[PDB]
Amino acid sequence: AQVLRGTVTDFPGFDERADAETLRKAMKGLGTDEESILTLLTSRSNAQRQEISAAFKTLFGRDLLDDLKSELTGKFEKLIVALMKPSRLYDAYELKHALKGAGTNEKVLTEIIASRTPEELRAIKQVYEEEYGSSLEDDVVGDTSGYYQRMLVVLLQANRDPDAGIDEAQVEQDAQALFQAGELKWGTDEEKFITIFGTRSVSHLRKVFDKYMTISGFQIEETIDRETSGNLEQLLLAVVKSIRSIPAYLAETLYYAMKGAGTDDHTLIRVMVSRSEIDLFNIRKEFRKNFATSLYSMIKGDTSGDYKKALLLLCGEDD
Ligand SMILES: [Ca+2]
Ligand SMILES: [Ca+2]
Fold first, then answer.
1. How far is the CA of 26 from the centre of ligand 1 (A)?
2. How far is the CA of 32 from the centre of ligand 1 (A)?
3. Cα dist. 98→17, 69, 122, 132, 226 in Å?
4. Which of 47, 190, 259, 301 could form a disulfide with 147 if both were Cys (CB 3.0 to 4.6 A apart)?
């Protein structure tokens, strides 16, 4: 399919001492030059941002991060601070920040654990432990319940079959189980639908989604309802949608985060930063295709200020 790319890449002919001085010049004295800051950081890669941060410290004896936290304000500050976080630690940080006793944010839990590949989930599990000194499963387990928690664990095991010629018997039989499960409202034999959804391979599972509607008339997603359903049905839907296309799922997330009154700035920030160098371009295409409107335009009509200016640049084009 389309090759996978972000909207941010290495700045060619990058100078971390020159960068560091531009940034210093933009904060030194009363006031701030927010346009210099947002225009520089937005067109430097995460790796480069970290390099500048280091040149900052060596040529001025100050911490780049703190200076930005005292110079900057609001949603704008939140966006730049996110941009500066090492890409290796970003996903674990967000997981960690969501797991909070009874205040736990399941939406974030669902969204990162359902759209990340095994390779990515394994790395997040290594990093999390290193940083917060505890394993991710234990924290998930301690702050979640029911088959929701059980399915989070199966997926965290980052262990789903590799692709191979499909076994067409297994597909019909597997489409059958899921049909019945839907009928009984996803609240019986969880152990059975759970092994199917988190262990079968992506190609096998795309065949199954196909058999299911032949053998049922509607698409799996129509048996779940993304507004009222529980934790578990919400996970089931994210999983089905991410199987079909990660960029299509992240594009929908961005859409419901702006769609309406206000904006879910947290969600908009978390998806734009995190995917800027992976698939933001692809998310842009799906978005446009599926919502009949460019992402660039929705952001432009939902945000304002330097917050808006930096997000339009990360977006980096009108589709
Ligand atoms: Ca200043
Ligand atoms: Ca809105």
1. 7
2. 5
3. 36, 22, 19, 13, 21
4. 190
CATH architecture of the region 160-245: Orthogonal Bundle (1.10)
Cα of 94 from ligand 1 centre, angstroms: 29
For residue 56, give both structure tokens. Answer: 């900052």
Give the number of whichever ligand sits closest to the CA of residue 298. Answer: 2
Identify the CA nearest to 94 among candidates 77, 84, 109, 83: 109
CATH code of the domain made up of 13-85: 1.10.220.10
Q: How far is the CA of 33 from the centre of ligand 1 (A)?
A: 8
Residues of the chain with CATH 1.10.220.10: 13-85, 86-159, 160-245, 246-317
Resolution (A): 2.4
Q: How many residues does the chain have?
A: 319
The domain covering 246-317 belongs, at the CATH homologous superfamily level, to Annexin (1.10.220.10)
CATH architecture under which domain 86-159 falls: Orthogonal Bundle (1.10)
For residues 208 and 172, is the Cβ–Cβ distance under 8 A? no
User: CB atoms < 10 A from the CB of 134, how many?
Assistant: 13
| Residue type (1 letter), 195 | T
Question: How many other C-beta atoms lie within 10 A of the C-beta of residue 162?
Answer: 8
SS (H, E, C) 68-115: HHHHCCHHHHHHHHHHHCCHHHHHHHHHHHHCCHHHCCHHHHHHHHHH
d(CA 259, ligand 2 centre) in Å:
5
> How many whole angstroms separate alpha carbon 221 and alpha carbon 215?
14
